[PDB]
Amino acid sequence: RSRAEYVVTKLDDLINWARRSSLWPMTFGLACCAVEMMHMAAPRYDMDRFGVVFRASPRQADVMIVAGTLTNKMAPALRKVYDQMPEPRYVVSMGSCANGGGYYHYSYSVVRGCDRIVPVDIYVPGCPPTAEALLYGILQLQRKIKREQKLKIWYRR
Protein backbone atom coordinates (compact mmCIF):
# COMPACT_ATOMS: atom_id res chain seq x y z
CA ARG A 1 0.00 0.00 0.00
CA SER A 2 1.09 3.58 -0.52
CA ARG A 3 -1.55 5.50 1.34
CA ALA A 4 0.80 7.44 3.52
CA GLU A 5 -1.14 6.23 6.52
CA TYR A 6 -0.08 2.64 6.00
CA VAL A 7 3.30 3.99 5.11
CA VAL A 8 3.57 5.68 8.46
CA THR A 9 2.03 3.33 10.97
CA LYS A 10 4.39 0.67 9.79
CA LEU A 11 7.35 3.03 10.27
CA ASP A 12 6.20 3.91 13.76
CA ASP A 13 5.93 0.29 14.64
CA LEU A 14 9.53 -0.29 13.62
CA ILE A 15 10.53 2.60 15.78
CA ASN A 16 8.52 1.17 18.70
CA TRP A 17 9.98 -2.32 18.13
CA ALA A 18 13.52 -0.98 18.38
CA ARG A 19 12.93 0.92 21.66
CA ARG A 20 10.78 -1.85 23.11
CA SER A 21 13.18 -4.69 22.28
CA SER A 22 16.26 -2.93 23.68
CA LEU A 23 15.50 -1.06 26.92
CA TRP A 24 18.64 -0.29 28.85
CA PRO A 25 17.78 0.26 32.46
CA MET A 26 19.64 2.02 35.27
CA THR A 27 19.04 1.04 38.93
CA PHE A 28 19.36 3.76 41.46
CA GLY A 29 19.23 0.91 43.89
CA LEU A 30 17.82 2.72 46.73
CA ALA A 31 16.98 0.34 49.56
CA CYS A 32 16.34 -3.33 49.05
CA CYS A 33 14.06 -3.75 46.13
CA ALA A 34 17.47 -3.46 44.41
CA VAL A 35 18.28 -6.99 45.68
CA GLU A 36 15.12 -8.21 44.00
CA MET A 37 16.24 -6.65 40.76
CA MET A 38 19.75 -8.07 40.90
CA HIS A 39 17.82 -11.33 40.99
CA MET A 40 16.16 -10.45 37.74
CA ALA A 41 19.58 -9.74 36.20
CA ALA A 42 20.67 -13.12 37.66
CA PRO A 43 20.19 -16.50 35.92
CA ARG A 44 16.70 -17.71 36.87
CA TYR A 45 15.08 -14.67 35.43
CA ASP A 46 17.57 -13.24 32.89
CA MET A 47 16.77 -9.65 32.12
CA ASP A 48 19.18 -9.61 29.23
CA ARG A 49 17.23 -12.37 27.53
CA PHE A 50 14.57 -9.74 26.90
CA GLY A 51 17.09 -7.12 25.73
CA VAL A 52 17.29 -5.34 29.00
CA VAL A 53 21.04 -4.77 29.74
CA PHE A 54 22.18 -5.55 33.18
CA ARG A 55 23.70 -2.10 33.76
CA ALA A 56 23.78 1.32 32.08
CA SER A 57 24.87 4.89 32.94
CA PRO A 58 22.29 7.64 32.86
CA ARG A 59 23.38 8.99 29.46
CA GLN A 60 22.77 5.61 27.74
CA ALA A 61 19.76 4.51 29.86
CA ASP A 62 16.22 4.17 28.34
CA VAL A 63 14.35 3.34 31.61
CA MET A 64 15.03 4.25 35.25
CA ILE A 65 13.83 1.71 37.84
CA VAL A 66 13.48 3.49 41.20
CA ALA A 67 13.83 0.67 43.71
CA GLY A 68 13.58 1.62 47.37
CA THR A 69 12.69 4.60 49.53
CA LEU A 70 13.24 7.97 47.89
CA THR A 71 14.32 9.87 51.00
CA ASN A 72 14.17 13.69 51.09
CA LYS A 73 17.94 14.01 50.72
CA MET A 74 18.06 11.67 47.70
CA ALA A 75 15.02 13.39 46.13
CA PRO A 76 17.06 16.20 44.47
CA ALA A 77 19.41 13.61 43.00
CA LEU A 78 16.77 11.32 41.57
CA ARG A 79 15.51 14.25 39.62
CA LYS A 80 18.96 15.25 38.46
CA VAL A 81 19.60 11.78 37.02
CA TYR A 82 16.07 11.63 35.49
CA ASP A 83 16.84 14.99 33.94
CA GLN A 84 20.21 13.71 32.62
CA MET A 85 18.78 10.93 30.44
CA PRO A 86 17.83 11.00 26.69
CA GLU A 87 14.67 12.42 25.01
CA PRO A 88 12.91 8.98 24.86
CA ARG A 89 13.06 8.10 28.61
CA TYR A 90 10.78 6.17 31.02
CA VAL A 91 10.50 5.48 34.81
CA VAL A 92 9.39 2.14 36.36
CA SER A 93 8.68 2.71 40.06
CA MET A 94 9.47 -0.51 41.98
CA GLY A 95 8.47 -1.26 45.58
CA SER A 96 5.72 -0.03 47.87
CA CYS A 97 8.45 2.26 49.27
CA ALA A 98 8.62 4.14 45.94
CA ASN A 99 5.15 3.55 44.45
CA GLY A 100 3.74 5.43 47.44
CA GLY A 101 5.56 5.81 50.75
CA GLY A 102 5.40 2.20 51.94
CA TYR A 103 5.99 1.29 55.51
CA TYR A 104 7.84 4.62 55.79
CA HIS A 105 5.02 6.76 54.28
CA TYR A 106 4.38 8.84 57.42
CA SER A 107 8.12 9.45 58.08
CA TYR A 108 9.59 12.98 57.91
CA SER A 109 12.48 12.00 55.70
CA VAL A 110 10.71 9.90 53.05
CA VAL A 111 9.04 11.36 49.92
CA ARG A 112 5.62 9.76 49.65
CA GLY A 113 6.25 8.26 46.22
CA CYS A 114 8.72 8.95 43.42
CA ASP A 115 5.91 10.14 41.16
CA ARG A 116 6.09 13.34 43.13
CA ILE A 117 9.63 13.84 41.89
CA VAL A 118 9.77 11.96 38.53
CA PRO A 119 6.80 11.14 36.22
CA VAL A 120 6.25 7.33 36.61
CA ASP A 121 5.03 5.05 33.76
CA ILE A 122 4.65 1.57 35.38
CA TYR A 123 4.17 1.03 39.15
CA VAL A 124 5.37 -2.45 40.26
CA PRO A 125 3.69 -3.40 43.60
CA GLY A 126 5.02 -5.49 46.55
CA CYS A 127 7.32 -4.71 49.47
CA PRO A 128 10.14 -6.77 47.82
CA PRO A 129 8.17 -6.69 44.47
CA THR A 130 8.87 -10.21 43.23
CA ALA A 131 11.55 -10.34 40.49
CA GLU A 132 9.02 -12.02 38.27
CA ALA A 133 6.72 -9.13 39.06
CA LEU A 134 9.37 -6.64 38.01
CA LEU A 135 9.82 -8.67 34.91
CA TYR A 136 6.04 -8.46 34.41
CA GLY A 137 6.32 -4.69 34.95
CA ILE A 138 9.18 -4.31 32.44
CA LEU A 139 7.11 -6.39 29.95
CA GLN A 140 4.08 -4.06 30.49
CA LEU A 141 6.37 -1.12 29.73
CA GLN A 142 7.12 -2.94 26.51
CA ARG A 143 3.36 -3.14 25.70
CA LYS A 144 3.03 0.58 26.65
CA ILE A 145 5.75 1.50 24.17
CA LYS A 146 4.29 -0.76 21.44
CA ARG A 147 1.01 1.22 21.60
CA GLU A 148 2.75 4.64 21.41
CA GLN A 149 2.11 6.18 17.95
CA LYS A 150 4.43 9.23 17.73
CA LEU A 151 4.73 9.62 13.93
CA LYS A 152 1.04 9.06 13.22
CA ILE A 153 0.27 11.97 15.49
CA TRP A 154 2.92 13.97 13.66
CA TYR A 155 1.28 13.07 10.33
CA ARG A 156 -2.22 13.86 11.69
CA ARG A 157 -0.98 17.09 13.25
Partner 1 sequence: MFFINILTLLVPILIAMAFLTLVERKILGYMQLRKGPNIVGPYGILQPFADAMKLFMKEPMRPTTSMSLFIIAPTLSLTLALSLWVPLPMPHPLINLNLGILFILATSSLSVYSILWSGWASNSKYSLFGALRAVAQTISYEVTMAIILLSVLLMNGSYSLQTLITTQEHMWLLLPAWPMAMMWFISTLAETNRAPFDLTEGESGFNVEYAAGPFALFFMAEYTNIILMNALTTIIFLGPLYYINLPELYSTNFMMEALLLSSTFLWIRASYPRFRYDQLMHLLWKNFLPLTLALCMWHISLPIFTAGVPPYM
Partner 2 sequence: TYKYVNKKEVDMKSATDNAARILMWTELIRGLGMTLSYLFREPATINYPFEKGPLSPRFRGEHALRRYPSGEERCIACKLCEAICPAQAITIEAEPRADGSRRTTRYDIDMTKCIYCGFCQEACPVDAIVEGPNFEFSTETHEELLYNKEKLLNNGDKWEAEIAANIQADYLYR
Partner 3 sequence: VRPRSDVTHKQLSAFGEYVAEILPKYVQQVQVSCLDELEICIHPDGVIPTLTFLRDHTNAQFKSLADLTAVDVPTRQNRFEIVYNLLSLRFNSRIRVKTYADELTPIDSIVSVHIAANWYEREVWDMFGVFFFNHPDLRRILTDYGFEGHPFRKDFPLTGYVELRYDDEVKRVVAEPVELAQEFRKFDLNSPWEAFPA
Ligand X SMILES: COC1=C(OC)C(=O)C(CC=C(C)C)=C(C)C1=O
Q: Which of residues 51-70 bind partner 2 (CB under 8 A)?
A: none
Q: What's the Cα-to-Cα distance from 7 to each of 1, 133, 157, rounded to whole Å?
A: 7, 37, 16
**Identified binder of ligand X from the candidate list 6, 14, 42, 55, rule CB under 6 A:** 55
Q: Does 32 bind ligand X (CB under 6 A)?
A: no
Rounded Cα–Cα distance for residues 131 and 50 (Å): 14
Q: Does 38 bind ligand X (CB under 6 A)?
A: yes
Nearer to ligand SF4, 113 or 128 (CB): 128
What is the number of the residue whose Cβ is closest to ligand UQ9? 56
Residues 23 and 141 sit within 8 Å (Cβ to Cβ): yes
Residues 140 and 122 sit within 8 Å (Cβ to Cβ): yes
Tell me the binding residues: 32-33, 97, 127
Q: Does 104 bind ligand UQ9 (CB under 6 A)?
A: no
